[PDB]
């Protein structure tokens, strides 16, 4: 069984086992069972699963060196597999909401859910709460008496929360901080002092590493039972860098990858989003350049967004980003080597994360 | 310390910590912890703490019962505010959601919280997400080392599920089931074939029940390690009960409440709930009178809502309202005879939560 075989068949049985209890317990009907599982299908699959995939991945290196009976090998990799589905479904449920929360129009070349002519949004806030739900069900279900399950819910709470708070950072990232108030509309930054490397890489730390890089391999190491083959530090600190560099690629190509590629119009230019581009082109831009870039910064108007475009072209901002690369790359290898100090096995499951982050 | 006392005592020291931990362990800046404190404020202050409170009545019931030293008493007492605050910050997620879900315009005498000028629905939806969130950060924070985390959790989460499951049927409720379907736009229903009492039932039960009545009866049990006292299956029959009755009163006052003391321009009629008049009055209409509802509900129109106000106040559903009030008078009495078998304490907290909402 090839890891990503077992891993879509164990989705097949999980959509069972949550469809059929919520109809032998929770007086669901055919038809909103129906509703549901398309809804599960449109909003979990069709991605590369790499979140979740990871999760499989680490529990693989471990068994590869780690005494088990046959069954228990299964009940294992069955594990990582539950596992990496609750991330995906995390991922899900913040996907719904978010499209929702920034009006976006497509997500994989498909609509948003929320777009979808029998969903809307009184519909999609909900699924989305739904999604998030059932990595609860899974969970109870599925590691009802493993001896992780505590650690497990409490780790999946930390990084859910956080991912939330992420979410907070990257809305807010136009505005002045000091003029936050739920009672004043928020104008968008004149100055853009807050965007700033610390700033931006708070942001991103919350928004996408815990999420994307430290749950599924902590995940991965829960299901294993190894947390003890490792330096919880130094595992926070490679997600840290890994997920910023991740979210350094993505803020490029939202910027400079043809819609059909992207699968997506790329609008963070409009949406005045703190990029990396625009962080970057800040820390490097004249004063002309910094006053021309404030004067079409955050603005639906197509001519203005070709300017700042052009600002970032003329800006060699290649080499910028080909240093930082330079400069991950060092520490990821770095902190590879700390790794394999308590654990070469984990050590080159991180080594296989960045291999596909890098290359990707 | 009166009870209300304690517990509005203990939302400040959660609020406290929450923040506080924000700052030392989500690197949250002050603005941002001052509008997230002002969200929670917001979202989670100035009703009436019903929910809440019954955790906190249910503990003091077994407190004056059951043997302990007084700091054990404070501790319980203490824990059973920590339960109910989470109820209400769940309740709170829910209706900063389904506002937004609704369209809602006021909430309590107040604009609901997306409507807030410095918030909007791109905030807001996230600010939900929190809410809910907070919950399972007070509940890890102080529960856990507490016999009932396990099982404390795992109901929480079984609650929230079907509170969700509840939404999906409330907003459905006017679509025919036999046409769900993600890629086309719902009709409403032209027949109202599924505006029954069996269907009501479903909505009222999955919707509100649970995280109404059960959830804080049971939470109320599990600080005080008194679930033996009990029968499960009488708690959740008399919490049904008592919940459907809760709904009628509300869709009653929807309807027929003056709006400054309702704190809402009730919209049932034009949102075309399934609502406990309809289903009555659907129940007792002749073919002319259905003809007409039909012609009339689900409809912005002011004189069309008129109409529907109309046919309902002809139909003396007061009569219908006073013969199901009387039988559940006597169902929630003879349940709180079958629950004073295994427990006088717990049939009289029951007798309180019925008294608290029969009056109302
Ligand atoms: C078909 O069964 C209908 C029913 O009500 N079952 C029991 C039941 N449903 C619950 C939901 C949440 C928490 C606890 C619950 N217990
Ligand atoms: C859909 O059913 C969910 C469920 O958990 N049913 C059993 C159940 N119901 C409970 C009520 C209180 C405490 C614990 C309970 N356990
Ligand atoms: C209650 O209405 C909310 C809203 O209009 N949100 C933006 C929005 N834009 C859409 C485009 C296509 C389909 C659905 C869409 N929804
Ligand atoms: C001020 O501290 C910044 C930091 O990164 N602290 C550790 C940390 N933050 C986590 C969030 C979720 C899950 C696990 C986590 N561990
Ligand atoms: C805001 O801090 C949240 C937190 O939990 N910090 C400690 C912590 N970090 C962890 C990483 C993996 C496993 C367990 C962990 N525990
Ligand atoms: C992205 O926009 C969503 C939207 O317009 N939702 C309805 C809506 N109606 C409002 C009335 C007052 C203040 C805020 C409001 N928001
Ligand atoms: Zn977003
Ligand atoms: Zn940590
Ligand atoms: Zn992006
Ligand atoms: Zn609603
Ligand atoms: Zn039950
Ligand atoms: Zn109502």
Known sequence: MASMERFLSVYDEVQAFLLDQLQSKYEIDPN?????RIMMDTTCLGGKYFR??????????????????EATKERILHDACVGGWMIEFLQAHYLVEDDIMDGSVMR?????????????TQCAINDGIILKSWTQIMAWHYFADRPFLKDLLCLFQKVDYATAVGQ???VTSMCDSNKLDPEVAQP???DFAEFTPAIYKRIVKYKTTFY??????????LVSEAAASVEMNLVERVAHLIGEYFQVQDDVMDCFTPPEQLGKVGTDIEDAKCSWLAVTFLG???????????????????????????????????????????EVVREVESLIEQLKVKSPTFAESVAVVWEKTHKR
Not at 285 to 290: E, F, G, I, Y
């Open 32 to 36: 909103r069972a129906r509703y549901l």
């Open 108 to 120: 994989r070349g498909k609509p948003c859910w929320y777009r979808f002519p029998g969903v809307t």
């Open 168 to 170: 907070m950072y990257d």
């Open 52 to 69: 979740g995939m990871t999760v499989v991945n680490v529990a693989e290196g471990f068994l590869a060196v780690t005494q088990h009976d």
């Open 212 to 221: 994307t890089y430290l749950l599924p391999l902590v995940m991965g190491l």
């Open 284 to 326: 490097k831009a004249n004063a002309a350049q910094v006053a021309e870039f404030k004067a079409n910064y955050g603005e639906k108007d197509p001519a203005k967004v070709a300017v700042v475009k052009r600002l970032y072209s003329k800006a060699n901002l290649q080499a910028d980003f080909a240093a930082y690369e330079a």
């Open 188 to 190: 968008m930054t004149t």
